[PDB]
Structure 1
Amino acid sequence: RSKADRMAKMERRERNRHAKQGESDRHNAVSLSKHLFSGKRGVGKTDFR
């Protein structure tokens, strides 16, 4: 039991370093966001204030 517990603790280390809320936290960020990197702003209506 203690050996398997130590194995699980050693396994946890990289997800803990990535600051996951647990096993179930698998949120994926996109590399680039088009709404943030698609700007060519004329004289008129913009996409944000």
Structure 2
Amino acid sequence: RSKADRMAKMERRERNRHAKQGESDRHNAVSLSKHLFSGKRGVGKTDFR
């Protein structure tokens, strides 16, 4: 069991460095979001406040 319980701690490390709050946090970061960078904003109605 202590052989098996230490293998839970060995396999947990990679998710802790990425600050995953579980073994079930698989929220994926989009590399480049479309609304941030694709636009040209001139006189008129604009894309935000």
Q: Normalised by the size of structure 2, how large is the TM-score?
A: 0.93
CA distance in 2, matches of 1:13, 1:44: 51
**Secondary structure of the equivalent of 1:7?**
helix
Q: Which has the higher helix share?
A: 2
CA distance in 2, matches of 1:13, 1:23: 11
> What stretches of structure 1 move > 6 A for 4+ residues in a row?
none
CA distance in 1, matches of 2:15, 2:37: 30
Q: Aligned pair count?
A: 49
CA root-mean-square deviation: 0.7
- Percent identity between the aligned chains? 100
Q: 1:5-40, CA deviations, whole angstroms, 9 ceiling, x for partnerless residues?
A: 101101000100000011111000111001001120
